[PDB]
Design a protein around this nucleic acid. Structure first.
Ligand code: NA
Ligand code: NA
Length: 327
DNA sequence: CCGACCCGCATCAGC
DNA sequence: GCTGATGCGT
DNA sequence: GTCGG
């Protein structure tokens, strides 16, 4: 439904949510607000009262009272006050740097560090992740169009295969469901020599190869099974340079790969329904394995998975395309 | 009423 | 020095 | 903040 329907309500709830996350440090409060703002974004009617809203799942008494104040007056007193509060807005603004969470934001602002400019003046006080988040502040807030993602997926699949042709790599995320744009790249990776009961360089070889060809430009973190960093498509030799982008690469045991691909493909709503259905059938699905449930509820040993379909077959479903996993 | 609401890595706190 | 807590991102 | 045992 058009954002003009309840966009004033959903912008209010999203602002309220950011302050819970970044200033209050109440992640559950943040998620209720985001939930309610989501269910209202999909409600196909211009809400006329807080009471109409309360019917919907995730909207309770406090959010029903805020919609009523917002409908009658056009604003929310408590939000208007938080917006003009110099400590709050500075803390909320600082968490937009990757690597600065609510705790570091509070400490920076507690000593006069309030802006990018102050950060640029105080690099001695930033860990490695935050220097990188500061360096690429604007680029990281930009979205990535699918044409760039296809180009980036090209480079990742080619260099992975260039390191070892038995590697299996799957760019998951909303990009695998067909999304027209993305906010980062999530690569899931496996090798037949790596299993649940099975070298600690499989990830490193692929990261190193992507660095040697100058696709990966920086590293936020890297261990034996997760790499988080920065990449960038090469310049056109005469055009503007592309903005640096975020990219994650996980190495997963081959016996849990398709469980992991299914999970990190999503959506989050689709995953819940499939987990919900799988229980009413006597199976438990998480991001690693699918296991059967005894009559008392005790899980059994994980069942063999060798594709996404294998999982669907177990729980008596017909394979759903990633395209159709919107819910 | 009142508890639930979903791990890998960098860094720090304590020993 | 090592082990465990915490912050952070996802 | 919302839900539910
Ligand atoms: Na409700
Ligand atoms: Na941040």
């Amino acid at each position: 439904p058009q954002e003009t329907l309840n966009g004033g309500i959903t912008d209010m709830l999203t602002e309220l949510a950011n302050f819970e996350k970044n200033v209050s440090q109440a992640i559950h409060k943040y998620n209720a607000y985001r939930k309610a703002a989501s269910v209202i974004a999909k409600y196909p009617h211009k809400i006329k009262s807080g009471a109409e809203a309360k019917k919907l799942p995730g909207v309770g008494t406090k959010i029903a009272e805020k919609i009523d104040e917002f409908l009658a007056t056009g604003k929310l007193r408590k939000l208007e006050k938080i917006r003009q509060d110099d400590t709050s807005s500075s803390i909320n603004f600082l968490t937009r740097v990757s690597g600065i969470g609510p705790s570091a934001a509070r400490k920076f602002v507690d000593e006069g560090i309030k802006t990018l400019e102050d950060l640029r003046k105080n690099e001695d006080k930033l860990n490695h992740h935050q220097r990188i988040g500061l360096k690429y502040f604007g680029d990281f807030e930009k979205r990535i169009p699918r044409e760039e993602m296809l180009q980036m997926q090209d480079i990742v699949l080619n260099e992975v295969k260039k390191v070892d042709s038995e590697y299996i790599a799957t760019v998951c995320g909303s990009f695998r469901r067909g999304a027209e744009s993305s906010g980062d790249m999530d690569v899931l990776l496996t090798h037949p020599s790596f299993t649940s009961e099975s070298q600690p360089k499989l990830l490193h070889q692929v990261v190193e190869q992507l660095q040697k060809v100058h696709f990966i430009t920086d590293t936020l973190s890297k261990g034996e099974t997760k790499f988080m960093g920065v990449c960038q498509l090469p310049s056109k030799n005469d055009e503007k340079e592309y903005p640096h982008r975020r990219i994650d690469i996980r190495l997963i045991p081959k016996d849990q790969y398709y469980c992991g691909v299914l999970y990190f493909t999503g959506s989050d709503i689709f995953n819940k329904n499939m987990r919900a259905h799988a229980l009413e059938k006597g199976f438990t699905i998480n991001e690693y394995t699918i296991r059967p449930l005894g009559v008392t509820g005790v899980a059994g040993e994980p069942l063999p998975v060798d594709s996404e379909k294998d999982i669907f077959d177990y729980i008596q479903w017909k394979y759903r395309e990633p395209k159709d996993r919107s819910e």
